[PDB]
Amino acid sequence: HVLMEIQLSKVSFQHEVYRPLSRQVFIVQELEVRDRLASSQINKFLYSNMLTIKALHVCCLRVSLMPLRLNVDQDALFFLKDFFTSLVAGINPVVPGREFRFTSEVPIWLDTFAGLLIGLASELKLKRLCCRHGLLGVDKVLGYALNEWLQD
Amino acid sequence: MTQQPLRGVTSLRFNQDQSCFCCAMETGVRIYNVEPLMEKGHLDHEQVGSMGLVEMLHRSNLLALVGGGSSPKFSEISVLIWDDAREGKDSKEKLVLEFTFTKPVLSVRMRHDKIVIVLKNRIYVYSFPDNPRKLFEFDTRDNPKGLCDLCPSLEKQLLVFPGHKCGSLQLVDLASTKPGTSSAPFTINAHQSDIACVSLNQPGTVVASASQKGTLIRLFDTQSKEKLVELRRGTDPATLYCINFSHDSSFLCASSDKGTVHIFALKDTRLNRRSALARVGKVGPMIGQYVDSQWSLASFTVPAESACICAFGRNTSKNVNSVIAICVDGTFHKYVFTPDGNCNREAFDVYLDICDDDDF
């Protein structure tokens, strides 16, 4: 068993509100991932704030440019990875294992991607994938793998 | 009576090297290359609302924006810095800086290391783009047109604006001024009536100015403060809209409410027309100032009811120089001129009807 607080305040998922067809805006007023791993105390992980990570249309995305997004130094950043392993052990079937402009839009204050985050624990930069369309619902990793980036 | 902006154009500005111009509008902002005439990008009403002022930093992604017109998203007391090279899904992520004031912003001037904000009675100077801090603040006379010019040279940090005395200029060397100290602005008594236009040449060695009478343009050396030349635009009063130097300081152009752009030679002043009375040698003690006045080498006509900015184009050949006029009615005019005073239209376009060629 684990204890890891996570908060998502005022997630105004007004699906099909309008954006013409199923705007379905996540419009997440706050998406602070309070904790993961073995830590139950709140420590600011991310994906007023207005973090519309999934503000949609008909096909779009966004990010809230918070001052610090990924502070991963608590217990094991791969403890959620073993949580996913125990999930696929419990959830026996695990299938998912205009232009987007699917920006990360945050001057990430950071501190295997998890391994490098642990080793490093500002230190990264926002992708600004304007009209990249690198994702295709299964090609999100492909769009994330476009080019290369490193800082500090 | 605020004239309703012809075709929604609220302000027009050349960038520091006159190679681009920016257009603030009721429908947002547009940015144009001058030669060839081509749209380089715009900000729509959905991004920025109606705009009062735009200033571009050289040929960069940095724009200084001031809300204005009929439907602004932003305050007329705020200067917003837009960075067009920033990737972001939200237009708000391209807004990188805000400078807020207690009164409406009447002009913004930029160079590589500084931004200048002009209010009616105050001028603020900040470091820019990196870690903006207030360097200087200057009190002015009533400056309702935001009249200010900033030398674009790397070697000289000269600022010029209307001085406290009517028809005077204040000049400030911002490199020789210790931050937080009043280096005393030096004063040039340029005119007897209020300043209507002021411009520095590219090296910041010469200042040109015209008053609200707009009959005379006066040039002064910025170091010695001596009057170098007095140019005569016309007999009749005219509201000047723009004065600019050629890149090499060999010429000066001037646009006005007469629907005329005048061109003056500065380097070879013999190319300028002189009054016929100057050939009727010195008959009597009272005609002296009209006899020494230099008239335009060349001039051309633009729509008289359309305010226009004017600048020099890139030299196309050893003896053919170009002048561009950009008019608030959405018209672009290019004229070629020669040292013998011929001046012919080379191009005419409606720059507001240039769509982005999304065809190629």
Swiss-Prot record, chain A:
Function comment: Lipid transfer protein involved in autophagosome assembly. Tethers the edge of the isolation membrane (IM) to the endoplasmic reticulum (ER) and mediates direct lipid transfer from ER to IM for IM expansion. Binds to the ER exit site (ERES), which is the membrane source for autophagosome formation, and extracts phospholipids from the membrane source and transfers them to ATG9 (ATG9A or ATG9B) to the IM for membrane expansion. Lipid transfer activity is enhanced by WIPI1 and WDR45/WIPI4, which promote ATG2A-association with phosphatidylinositol 3-monophosphate (PI3P)-containing membranes.
Complex formation: Interacts with ATG9A (via C-terminus). Interacts (via WIPI-interacting region) with WDR45B/WIPI3. Interacts (via WIPI-interacting region) with WDR45/WIPI4. Interacts with TMEM41B. Interacts with VMP1.
UniProt subcellular location: Preautophagosomal structure membrane; Lipid droplet; Endoplasmic reticulum membrane
Family: Belongs to the ATG2 family.
Name under which the protein is recorded: Autophagy-related protein 2 homolog A
Domain notes: The chorein N-terminal domain mediates lipid transfer activity.
From Swiss-Prot, chain B:
Chief localization: other
InterPro entries per record: PROPPIN, WD40/YVTN_repeat-like_dom_sf, WD40_repeat_dom_sf, WD40_rpt
Activity regulation note: Activated upon amino-acid starvation.
Tissue and organ distribution: Ubiquitously expressed, with high expression in skeletal muscle and heart. Weakly expressed in liver and placenta. Expression is down-regulated in pancreatic and in kidney tumors.
Impact reported for D17A: Decreased interaction with ATG2A. Loss of interaction with ATG2A
This protein's UniProt keywords: Autophagy, Cytoplasm, Disease variant, Lipid-binding, Neurodegeneration, Repeat, WD repeat
Pfam families, per the entry: PROPPIN
Disease: Neurodegeneration with brain iron accumulation 5: A neurodegenerative disorder associated with iron accumulation in the brain, primarily in the basal ganglia. NBIA5 is characterized by global developmental delay in early childhood that is essentially static, with slow motor and cognitive gains until adolescence or early adulthood. In young adulthood, affected individuals develop progressive dystonia, parkinsonism, extrapyramidal signs, and dementia resulting in severe disability.
Domain notes from UniProt: The L/FRRG motif is required for recruitment to PtdIns3P.
Family: Belongs to the WD repeat PROPPIN family.
Protein known as: WD repeat domain phosphoinositide-interacting protein 4
